[PDB]
Design a protein around this ligand. Structure first.
Ligand SMILES: [Cu+2]
Ligand SMILES: [Cu+2]
Ligand SMILES: [Mn+2]
Length: 507
């Protein structure tokens, strides 16, 4: 008997990985596509032998439909809250905007978008059902995505203040792909050989319902209470637990996204088989990079090419080397489909034809930004950026035209994936420091030389693993779109209490 709450009873590899359908526009105005995407409560089956689970899905599907655009192609999206009045999951009423009704508030952030602030999905721009109540920064029912950025695998997800962890866990995320003009003249695997992989950890009650904590263990006196992490006991890809993908012995492009609330994975293919990275969060690399492991924190993504042609007749497990047991397994590739005509795809010698260089010594401004926790009056951790809470006066006010270096000083014992909106950055380096000395008097005593970014994280990025006991330095240049944005940890349990700060980009 399969008990959804007991992962040892779940037979792995029973579900063929699904491909989310592509969103179709409802209209086109003067050449601009118009989409209408409604958030709905629906059943979704996470495993062949599970009962249906009630979830929240964009257009009633999990993952949400994949939106595809060209670079520089302006589109309009009316994101609609068509959800019930009561939440699926427990709400901590001590957080932002959760004291009373409306409980079900939504706003959609296109993660990685170069977009004007009023279509960025600001956390205070949320709306209840049919826009009946709206947050203070609400501006547009119909968002406008101008897409003036390098081609990339982006993703969209809920960002409503105080409940982002709940709305994303309930199912509100999907892929958004910007095609670069270069790709038309490359021969990357395409069409059915270009497959997105949304990796997420989940836990379930015995009746198949989504399980999310009511409180910590041991419990806080607040009920329900936020917990500063969520680690599931199953891994799903594209909404199916421990699936298989039946592939031909040829090359595929996989668009790999960690859309988990907290958990990070280190991907390994079979017995350390090689695969070829072609993009990071922000777009294509200069040239493919040979990898045998791929670490991904929440919100990080990378596109890779895997060649199955030398693996005909094999089944290869995609491992998560961060964990033992069942959580060490993501999915299985079954190289068992007969080849459907010749593989004409190629791993190219170069991907893009231009690269923008940013130099640390050209920085117009340098920010030292601590990642830490305090204890609240209930003895719960509050995760904080720069000693400040969300509602404290804005301190990050980057100026258009300026090059900035941000130094993320992680004084906690765990990594935090820090996401900066509107821009893409390059990781400069990480440098270890003496944690106890910093705790004593705030002096940064470096205990070793700077370490370069690892080989899989050298492209343009918007989410960076800030390692504990290290200063992680990133570099960026602000070029357009002044307005009200944010930066935050992408562990959603941290973002919601309270590890998010305003970023006011100014002219
Ligand atoms: Cu964090
Ligand atoms: Cu965000
Ligand atoms: Mn995001």
């Amino acid at each position: 008997k399969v008990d959804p709450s007991n992962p040892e009873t779940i037979p792995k590899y029973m579900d063929e990985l699904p491909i989310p359908p592509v969103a179709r526009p409802l209209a086109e105005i003067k050449g601009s596509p118009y989409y209408e995407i409604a958030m709905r409560q629906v059943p979704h089956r996470f495993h062949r032998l599970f009962p249906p689970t009630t979830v929240w899905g964009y257009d009633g599907m999990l993952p949400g439909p994949t939106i595809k655009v060209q670079k520089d192609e302006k589109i309009y999206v009316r994101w609609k809250n068509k959800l019930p009045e009561k939440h699926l999951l427990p709400i901590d009423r001590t957080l932002h905007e959760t004291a009373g009704p409306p409980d079900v508030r939504t706003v959609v952030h296109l993660h990685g978008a170069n977009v004007a602030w009023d279509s960025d999905g600001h956390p205070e721009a949320w709306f209840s059902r049919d826009f009946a109540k709206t947050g203070a920064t609400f501006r547009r029912k119909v968002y406008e995505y101008t897409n003036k950025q390098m081609g990339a695998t982006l993703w969209y997800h809920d960002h409503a203040i105080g409940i982002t962890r709940l709305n994303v866990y309930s199912g509100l995320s999907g892929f958004y792909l910007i095609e670069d003009p270069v790709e038309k003249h490359l021969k990357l695997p395409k069409d059915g050989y270009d497959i997105p992989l949304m990796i997420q950890d989940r836990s379930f009650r015995s009746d198949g319902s989504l399980s999310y904590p009511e409180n910590t263990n041991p419990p806080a006196p607040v009920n329900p209470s936020v917990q500063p992490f969520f680690i599931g006991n199953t891994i799903a890809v594209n909404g199916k637990i421990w699936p298989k993908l039946t592939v031909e012995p040829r090359k595929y492009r996989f668009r790999i996204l960690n859309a988990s609330n907290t958990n990070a994975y280190t991907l390994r293919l079979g017995d350390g088989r090689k695969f070829y990275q072609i993009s990071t969060d922000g777009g294509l690399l200069t040239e493919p990079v040979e990898l045998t492991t791929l670490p991904l924190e929440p919100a990080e993504r990378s596109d890779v090419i895997i060649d199955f042609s030398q693996h005909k007749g094999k089944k290869l497990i995609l491992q998560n080397t961060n964990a033992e047991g069942n959580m060490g397994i993501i999915m299985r590739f079954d190289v068992l489909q007969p080849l459907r005509g010749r593989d004409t795809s190629e791993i190219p010698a170069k991907l893009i034809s231009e690269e923008q260089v940013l130099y640390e010594h050209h920085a117009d401004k340098t920010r030292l930004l601590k990642l830490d926790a305090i204890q609240d009056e209930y003895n719960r951790p509050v995760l904080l950026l720069d000693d400040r809470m969300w509602h404290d006066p804005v301190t990050e006010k980057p100026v258009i035209g300026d090059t900035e270096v941000w130094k993320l000083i992680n004084v906690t014992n765990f990594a935090h994936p820090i996401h900066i909106h509107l821009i893409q950055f390059k990781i400069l380096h990480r440098t270890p420091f003496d944690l106890e000395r910093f705790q004593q008097d705030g002096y940064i005593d470096y205990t070793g030389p700077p370490i370069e970014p690892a080989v899989h994280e050298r492209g343009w990025k918007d989410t960076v693993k800030a390692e504990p006991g290290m200063v992680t330095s990133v570099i960026m240049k602000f070029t357009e779109n002044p307005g009200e944005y944010v930066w935050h940890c992408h562990i959603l349990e941290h973002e919601d209490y309270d590890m998010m700060r305003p970023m006011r980009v100014v002219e």
